[PDB]
Amino acid sequence: NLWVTVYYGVPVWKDAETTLFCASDAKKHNVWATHCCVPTDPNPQEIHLENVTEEFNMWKNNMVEQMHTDIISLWDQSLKPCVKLTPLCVTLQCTNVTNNITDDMRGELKNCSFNMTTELRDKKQKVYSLFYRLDVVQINNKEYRLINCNTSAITQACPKVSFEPIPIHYCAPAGFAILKCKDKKFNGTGPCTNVSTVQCTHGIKPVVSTQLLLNGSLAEEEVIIRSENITNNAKNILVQLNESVQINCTRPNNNTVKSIRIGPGQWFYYTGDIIGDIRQAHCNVSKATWNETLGKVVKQLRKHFGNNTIIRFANSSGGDLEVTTHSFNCGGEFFYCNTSGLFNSTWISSNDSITLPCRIKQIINMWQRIGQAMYAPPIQGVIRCVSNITGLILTRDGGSTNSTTETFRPGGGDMRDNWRSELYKYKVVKIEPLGVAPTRCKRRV
Amino acid sequence: NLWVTVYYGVPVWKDAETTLFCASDAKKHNVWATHCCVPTDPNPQEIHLENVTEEFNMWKNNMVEQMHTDIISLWDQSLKPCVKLTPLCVTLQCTNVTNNITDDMRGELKNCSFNMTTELRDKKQKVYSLFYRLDVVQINNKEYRLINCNTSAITQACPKVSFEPIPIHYCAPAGFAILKCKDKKFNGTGPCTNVSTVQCTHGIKPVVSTQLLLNGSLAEEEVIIRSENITNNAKNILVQLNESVQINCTRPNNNTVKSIRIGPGQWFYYTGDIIGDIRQAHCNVSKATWNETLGKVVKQLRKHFGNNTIIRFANSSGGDLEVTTHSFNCGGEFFYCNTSGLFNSTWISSNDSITLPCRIKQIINMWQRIGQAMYAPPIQGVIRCVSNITGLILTRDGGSTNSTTETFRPGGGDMRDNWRSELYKYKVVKIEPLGVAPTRCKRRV
Amino acid sequence: NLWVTVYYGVPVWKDAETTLFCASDAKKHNVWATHCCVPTDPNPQEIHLENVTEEFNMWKNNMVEQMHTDIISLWDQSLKPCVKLTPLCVTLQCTNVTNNITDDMRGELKNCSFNMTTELRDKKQKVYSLFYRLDVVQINNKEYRLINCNTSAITQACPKVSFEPIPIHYCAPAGFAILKCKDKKFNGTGPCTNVSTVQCTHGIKPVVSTQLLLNGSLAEEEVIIRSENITNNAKNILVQLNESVQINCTRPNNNTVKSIRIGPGQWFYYTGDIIGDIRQAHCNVSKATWNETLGKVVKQLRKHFGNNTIIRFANSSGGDLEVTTHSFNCGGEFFYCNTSGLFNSTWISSNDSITLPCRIKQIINMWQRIGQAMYAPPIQGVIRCVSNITGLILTRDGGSTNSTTETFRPGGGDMRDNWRSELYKYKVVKIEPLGVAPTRCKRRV
Amino acid sequence: LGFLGAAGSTMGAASMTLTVQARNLLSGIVQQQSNLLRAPECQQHLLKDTHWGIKQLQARVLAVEHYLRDQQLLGIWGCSGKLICCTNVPWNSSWSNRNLSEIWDNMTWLQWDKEISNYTQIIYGLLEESQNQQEKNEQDLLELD
Amino acid sequence: LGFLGAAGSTMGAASMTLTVQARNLLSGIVQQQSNLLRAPECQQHLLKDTHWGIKQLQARVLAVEHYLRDQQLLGIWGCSGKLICCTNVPWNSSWSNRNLSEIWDNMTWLQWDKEISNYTQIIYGLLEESQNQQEKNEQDLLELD
Amino acid sequence: LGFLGAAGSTMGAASMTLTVQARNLLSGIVQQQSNLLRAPECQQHLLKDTHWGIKQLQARVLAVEHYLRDQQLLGIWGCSGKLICCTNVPWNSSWSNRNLSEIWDNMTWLQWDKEISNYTQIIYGLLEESQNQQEKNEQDLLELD
Ligand SMILES: *[C@@H]1O[C@H](CO)[C@@H](O[C@@H]2O[C@H](CO)[C@@H](O[C@@H]3O[C@H](CO[C@H]4O[C@H](CO)[C@@H](O)[C@H](O)[C@@H]4O)[C@@H](O)[C@H](O[C@H]4O[C@H](CO)[C@@H](O)[C@H](O)[C@@H]4O)[C@@H]3O)[C@H](O)[C@H]2NC(C)=O)[C@H](O)[C@H]1NC(C)=O
Ligand SMILES: *[C@@H]1O[C@H](CO)[C@@H](O[C@@H]2O[C@H](CO)[C@@H](O)[C@H](O)[C@H]2NC(C)=O)[C@H](O)[C@H]1NC(C)=O
Ligand SMILES: *[C@@H]1O[C@H](CO)[C@@H](O[C@@H]2O[C@H](CO)[C@@H](O)[C@H](O)[C@H]2NC(C)=O)[C@H](O)[C@H]1NC(C)=O
Ligand SMILES: *[C@@H]1O[C@H](CO)[C@@H](O[C@@H]2O[C@H](CO)[C@@H](O)[C@H](O)[C@H]2NC(C)=O)[C@H](O)[C@H]1NC(C)=O
Ligand SMILES: *[C@@H]1O[C@H](CO)[C@@H](O[C@@H]2O[C@H](CO)[C@@H](O)[C@H](O)[C@H]2NC(C)=O)[C@H](O)[C@H]1NC(C)=O
Ligand SMILES: *[C@@H]1O[C@H](CO)[C@@H](O[C@@H]2O[C@H](CO)[C@@H](O)[C@H](O)[C@H]2NC(C)=O)[C@H](O)[C@H]1NC(C)=O
Ligand SMILES: *[C@@H]1O[C@H](CO)[C@@H](O[C@@H]2O[C@H](CO)[C@@H](O)[C@H](O)[C@H]2NC(C)=O)[C@H](O)[C@H]1NC(C)=O
Ligand SMILES: *[C@@H]1O[C@H](CO)[C@@H](O)[C@H](O)[C@H]1NC(C)=O
Ligand SMILES: *[C@@H]1O[C@H](CO)[C@@H](O)[C@H](O)[C@H]1NC(C)=O
Ligand SMILES: *[C@@H]1O[C@H](CO)[C@@H](O)[C@H](O)[C@H]1NC(C)=O
């Protein structure tokens, strides 16, 4: 003699995709200080869910896609009110910079001059400036043009706007909740038994890189290797380290920045000249930290590829700098570092820091899109930054013939991987408070 | 002893104006494939309303106005990201195209050259191209300019975007319903007794034309002549045929299209030259189909103008091509056909197809607005299309002295008429579920 | 034996900040006729609140901030579709206008010529025009440029758009109410005992000025002096007069306006020449009205500064014209009047109108922002306007040593003061209908 | 009978489909929004096209406001939980003096609404007052006991 | 008395206008929107001016959310159908020990809200718990019978 | 226990937190909006950034629509004023023939929803019909008396 009884306020949920709030920790001109304008809670108090098991899947996590979209949108907006540099698509007269230049810098930097516009349409000015060779290509005392002029408009990023990543917390809108997995051994998929509910994620700095994962969180206890499919050589492997590796990067040349008007309030910045000698930009890691780090990675790779097999590391297979080098933003400057100095070993059954030479570019095709290109204004002085390697993006070459030797390379370059590696522990669900159950109760008639 | 009783969920409604959803049948780069992104139901099941009589009025139907607004808005958006052609407002040096040109094409097409911009501000290129005379006017081996340069900016329609109309269904938002009139004899106004309710209209292709109504629906049983007022010569008459007339249109010249950069990714398309001889564009209908069609129209006009009176057809009274010719989009090309070959008869108490010569224009002032003009890029090869005449827009000249002879002309040109002719059977109403009635019931006190 | 009883529909409220509707009195091309498109009620009937005392504070009134934001936004929108005048940043060849010019106008107006663009990129035209010296500066038969070209883009205000202020009513959104203070002696802060509730304010014309407050409401009974703090010389004093002072302004020169195309539909307007002689623009007030008005102001200042002390008036201390002169819009023209002719007296224990010479500017930096500048097109003919002084913005110099003499100057220039002076009687509150109270009632168990 | 299936039915018979009509507004809102949410490209369209995105929100907001307005009226009349409710307001022959059996057995709701379309605001004002008085009377009964 | 006509009235008298105040929010929303809908040019303005259109939607959405928040509170306290409801939560002298006759006959609601403004969240929490217990008790009575 | 604190609890125990869950949606809406309203620069952002402003309104509108949809269902089933309500629809062993004591004492609501997830639309249709019949019966009882 069971009857339907309806209950409202039932503590259940379903997988769902919604829009999350971006909230900062309450950097005056930082693009991330703004936009994520709703402040976070001083205490985004967590509620543990006793006896709840739930399934997580980082490669199906739509929080990654939202972040990706928001990162792009914010950048496009921040460049919207900045000076366009289309007046720079002129022919350039260029020669080699001649100074006390080291061998590795010969022909690396060019000395160009051109007729630039001024605030009046009747007047031109001669501009003398230095450009890195990667931004300048030949047309045919030789004729050159900026590399982007045959493809898209170039705009100047505003020098007053900082893009330095600060922690960002994503918060669920009412009606939704975020489930957080605390299983220290969670590999990116499957059930998790230590689950709490939060309204906001912890802060994730929106750090962009192509090979080494910088300034993320560390794994507890052991290096965790997470991949969508272990035996699929078409998939990337995200390796989260349980220790950090410090990288010291520099742009050793002391630059003098000049600024001219090229129109009505249209200020344009360029490198005028360089003080001191010319040296190549570079990044250092100690050899011991790097070698110990790989040994740990290998011990863990061996659980998937065999503890009696050989794991070797090799450099990038090919592609453009955005694909083959380790790219990052260092104080507003854009570095493209040669990581072949790191991925060179075979693993089988007194710092001597590894120095990675780095190239510098001012014209950046962000997100590998064809469309508006960004011009990074030069930075006055000498640039130094220190970053933490918190992970790696590796790919297995595959093509294996069961020779027992496998090769891994610093592949990747898909920007979403940089966030998937932090958001792997979060899931968004919709609350479904209405439901029914049987009972020995009938409505009074 | 009657009391007020309140009922909620009452099946009644009121005339209303709201915003309808645009929904396509789930054409990768078609502007209509997109935008009307919410898919239609696989079965937009209709509910017949037994014993419901309702009044319809096609000339007061606000669904027409919504479509008109949406058509314009969508086009303006689709041209928003396309290359501007303002660098083309230069003086042109033009001569007559000289080739094997038929008599009807003499002076029709001009051979022009000019200094066009390139991706660099310091460089110009000589462009040689062909233009139709309708797009080019004199300034004073003679000096010419594009016709639009003294009025508005010209922009290029993107060659990758198709504007080919596909069926569009309009759907009511929740709280509203669409009432559909099934009376086969419905003349556009008054009560209709066979009424069903639907959530979505059938698909209407947003076909644009100025005189003949193309690719619409056909009337059942007989030709239906619908006008706001029969005796008002200031009103248009929309004639819906119960049979179709096939029209075969061609642009017989085999065009070679050239493409240059005129700026940073700014690709511009133009006709370079023509392969083969030069012939005039034209459209064919058989004489028998056309003559039978008019005979049917006349039989029906006679019910309004007298079955002992004379009905004659004549061509356009005057105005620009957008007013006097039959205009349509044929595979992206814009045709302006001389319909005097059709409207030439007097009706009283072996195909020999009628050939209508057609002019071609590349600069289009869509919707007869003064403002941004569109440049239709040329199409490579030879163009063929076949369309169905499903109706006519006719106007009576009026000015009658009761001579017993009336004259009708292929007037119109008001784009809203093209949709009113399909939407005539639909009405939008607001649902009003709350109401009261008397009964022998009082609330328990 | 008291119990909680919950009541809904409780007539209480809280101070709140919300967005108000802008509503006009239902001026075809007036920017204020549009935008404030929701019409006002024919009878925005007021409800008096018997026995309600509420606290008002005009310097904390957020209605002022909303108006300020809306004024700016509307103007920026209205200029959005207008012709840009960036082609005017060319070198100018200028000489002194030579005609029958009075002494006060010598060198005031310059005769300039330049190469302007045309609808074709290959053609230039010579433009001869007159400019006021305030809009033109030297580069080094002398070389000049427009004053704005080194700072920002200049755009033309559309000549067809009127900015003539018309009364604007602000209306609360549902859930909010506006409380109106009727205390005739209300000084801007504190409790008010004669309070009514309205849905809409009375109409306030959005009149812009810098020193004299024009076309506002008058005080009843006596001049009211309102300031945030009487003894703070850093604060402005808003004086609301109980009588008006009439000002007759003229631009005595009969201007001939020329119009050319400078691009594709890009019409540009400029003063071609002047008919008749050249005279200086000016504004008149009678001396008696002005002197009586100040005597009244002084009687009231004495209640705050001592009725045995000396009050003197003096002119502006320094700054640009936007700061030191009385600025206003006269029929679309922009006047900058020298008010030293008014504020010149010492007050101690046959009209002879005061004539204020005025300068004219065409390039206006509205709201004192650095950014896009507006070009005011010239007006054909002779300009006359008559305005009412309804108030003054005064500042006390301070720096007093208790000498018993205080000096007041026509300071101000903060545009928000112009509205604060009208909105001082209104407050916006949020309705809070839910609340509880004790009673001898328990829910039946 | 389906949505508005009863529109041509007489009032009596029509009352048995009040549930069909009542649910149509919010059910339609969630299903239409679902079709929109299920099309990621359409979601991109909502932001890419500012005017379209605004038109859609305006339509949804308005639909909600109408739902709520009617619900509040039922609330203030003491009919929040009912599709059919009797009240303490007598029927006026001045609104309609038509026979009760014609009203329920021959006439449809469409016809009926026309029959009394100019008294709607009167009836609603009366219902409001009657309920206000009733609630005060109920409180007085509780204070008395 | 009109909207807020009772604001200066004492609480007792003021309670007779609870209907006036209760309807003002949604009634105002539909009438203001109607004035906007009746002006086709104003509708064009909502789309032509992106910021204005957003400000208007934001205001409308917020007004709806406040309406609903209050309705839910009445719902969870078991007062969804009432303008006036008595509950099972006793009054605390610590919130107010003022004489009942002053509260209803001399004081206005504005004054009263100030008198107990720091206990609102306490009372609301108590009301929530009391109703939760009551509903469980009701189910137990039905299972018992 | 906090929001979803009862998620791992058995159904019986979990029912004592229905108030916690019920309020979370609208309470969260007003608190999140408050954090946004309290940041004038963020308000400027809502208009400066068209896409962000649209995304936020879309999220808020959708949250409201879901709230209301569920409330209407309770309304049409005659449960508008209850967190827990019994009805006149019998339980089908074809939906679930599991022991009542396992359902309330061992199983959680998450498990239960999975147990009967394919019958939700059946039960809801039955509830609608049952209430419709009940209301007609109530009117007949009033006309009879
Ligand atoms: C304080 O308030 C006063 C009014 O109380 C304002 O004074 C008015 O200002 C307006 C705008 O400058 C003046 O309007 C202009 O009047 C000119 C003369 O018109 C005469 O002939 C017409 C015939 O129909 C009469 O109705 C009128 O009363 C006059 O006798 C017109 O030639 C002007 O036309 C120009 O603008 C219109 C758009 O408005 C265009 O359509 C035209 O093509 C043309 O470009 C214009 O209409 C008005 O005359 C002034 N009133 C008085 C009594 O003088 C002050 O300006 C205001 N002060 C401040 C600071 O805001
Ligand atoms: C880069 O090119 C500029 C342009 O020619 C060089 O600048 C000139 O240097 C000489 C020698 O000191 C001066 O006399 C000229 O007056 C400078 N010209 C200008 C325009 O400033 C510059 O030296 C070159 N630098 C390098 C490292 O090659
Ligand atoms: C800037 O423009 C000037 C044009 O005046 C260039 O100088 C000219 O160069 C051409 C090519 O050799 C000569 O024929 C002219 O006689 C030069 N004119 C003068 C007066 O210098 C100059 O080279 C341009 N500079 C750059 C790098 O753009
Ligand atoms: C249209 O004009 C172009 C430009 O003059 C003509 O092209 C030239 O044709 C001659 C003869 O074959 C060639 O020797 C030239 O090299 C061509 N010039 C260029 C720039 O390509 C073209 O023949 C003309 N066509 C017609 C039909 O009149
Ligand atoms: C493109 O520009 C060149 C300018 O170099 C034009 O050729 C000039 O034409 C003028 C006018 O007859 C002559 O005075 C010059 O001597 C010519 N210069 C040279 C080197 O050709 C050319 O006609 C322009 N072409 C078009 C059609 O725009
Ligand atoms: C302002 O400058 C213009 C430009 O020189 C003067 O216009 C010329 O006046 C003379 C004498 O009447 C005429 O012969 C010329 O044909 C005019 N030139 C043009 C281009 O129109 C004008 O007179 C000057 N006005 C004043 C007051 O100085
Ligand atoms: C407009 O441009 C012409 C260029 O043709 C200017 O006139 C030239 O001025 C320079 C400088 O004195 C002379 O060297 C040229 O010989 C002149 N050319 C001719 C044919 O006039 C003219 O001054 C410019 N006008 C303005 C005011 O911009
Ligand atoms: C239509 O009228 C017929 C004849 O009286 C009746 O039997 C039928 O039920 C009516 N239809 C509706 C929907 O009421
Ligand atoms: C205002 O006070 C007087 C005097 O006590 C009283 O008679 C009147 O009703 C009060 N007004 C209101 C609105 O309560
Ligand atoms: C988890 O399981 C244990 C053991 O049966 C039980 O005592 C505890 O109450 C459960 N937790 C929850 C939230 O039900």
Author numbering:
A (entry chain C), B (entry chain E), C (entry chain A): 33 to 58, 64 to 141, 150 to 185, 188 to 309, 312 to 323, 323A, 324 to 397, 410 to 505
D (entry chain F), E (entry chain B), F (entry chain D): 520 to 664
Manuscript excerpt for this entry:
Envelope glycoprotein (Env) trimers derived from the BG505 genotype are the basis of many current HIV vaccine development efforts. When expressed as ectodomain constructs stabilized with SOSIP mutations, trimers based on this clade A sequence can be readily produced at high yields while preserving the native-like, pre-fusion conformation targeted by known broadly neutralizing antibodies (bnAbs). Herein, we introduce cryoelectron microscopy-based polyclonal epitope mapping (cryoEMPEM): a method for rapid, high-resolution structural characterization of antibody-antigen complexes without the need for mAb isolation.
To explore the effects of nanoparticle presentation of BG505 SOSIP trimers on the epitope specificities of vaccine-elicited antibodies, we used the computationally designed tetrahedral nanoparticle scaffold T33-3154,55. This nanoparticle consists of four copies each of two complementary trimeric components, referred to as T33-31A and T33-31B. Additionally, the analysis of the two BG505 SOSIP structures (A and B) revealed that the presented trimer antigens are folded correctly in the native-like, pre-fusion state. Consistent with the structural data, biolayer interferometry (BLI) experiments demonstrated that the antibody binding profiles of BG505 SOSIP fused to each nanoparticle were equivalent to those of free trimers.
